[PDB]
Amino acid sequence: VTSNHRASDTVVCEGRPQVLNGRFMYGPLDVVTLTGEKVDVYVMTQPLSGKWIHFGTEVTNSSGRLTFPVPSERALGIGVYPVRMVVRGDHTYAECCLTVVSRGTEAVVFSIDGSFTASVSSDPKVRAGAVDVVRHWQDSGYLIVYVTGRPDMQKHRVVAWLSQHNFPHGVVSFCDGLTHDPLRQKAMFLQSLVQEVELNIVAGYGSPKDVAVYAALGLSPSQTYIVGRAVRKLQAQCQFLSDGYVAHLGQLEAGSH
């Protein structure tokens, strides 16, 4: 019964086509699919104004998915813009941000569950000092990118958790839920960030499974930060945060990176 819509946080290099994506579903399991419906797409072009601008309309396909191209004459310049997509039939919606960047914008990636969770589920507990480390990278001039292997069906819950513990705003990306190979889906997403969006990814955080993702991107072991105690098989492939995030933060502020 309850709507479970999501829209993808989109990051895009200036001058390039701007495409917004969304998926529209009802139910806990997304049991109902919203097929063939009109969805109106709004952008808050003046991000602090609270005023929505209608940009156009699309129709969901058989899987409830939506792809919306921003008309060239309405392309947004550099900045971060709220986006809201509204189902015309019931006035339900999804929200996300459109982030427009200059070429070569520098970013840092955090794998959510691997980087931030301390326990399993019941809201997982957050690792101590995690938020401050992410906040340190943002205040230092880096675009924050959050990736997770979870399906975007779970986006509402994941974002609520990030927001509850006060994580900095960033670009959040999930798996489509259908690939069955999340590690490669993440690697490919981050590659697309570097190749199509032209981001310069300077550091990667996660747990042991993420080393293969960051390695596939071309990150060096010194730029790869992995939570927990050193693991022998991974010895030269990454930096282990053996002492925790608080200690790691002091090391970053003495200019470790």
Ligand X SMILES: CCCCCC(=O)OC[C@H](COP(=O)(O)O)OC(=O)CCCCC
User: Torsion angle of alpha carbons 55, 60, 64, 69, nearest 10°?
Assistant: -40
If one asks whether residue 206 binds ligand X (CB under 6 A), the answer comes out as: yes
Q: Which of 182, 217, 219, 226 binds ligand X (CB under 6 A)?
A: 182
CB of 151 to ligand X, least distance (A): 7
Beta carbon nearer to ligand X, 150 or 156: 150
- Rounded to the nearest angstrom, the gap between the alpha carbon of residue 66 and the centroid of all alpha carbons in its chain is 18
CB of 180 to ligand X, least distance (A): 11
Per-residue x/- marks for ligand X, 126-155, CB under 6 A? ---------------------xxxx-----
Question: Of 196, 153, 150, 180, which Cα lies nearest the Cα of 33?
Answer: 153
If one asks whether residue 114 binds ligand X (CB under 6 A), the answer comes out as: yes
Q: Which of 14, 95, 106, 113 binds ligand X (CB under 6 A)?
A: 113
CB of 239 to ligand X, least distance (A): 17
Cα(77)–Cα(46) distance, integer angstroms: 11
If one asks whether residue 107 binds ligand X (CB under 6 A), the answer comes out as: no
Q: Which of 85, 107, 112, 133 binds ligand X (CB under 6 A)?
A: 112
Question: What does the binding site for ligand X look like in residue numbers (CB under 6 A)?
Answer: 111-114, 147-150, 182, 206
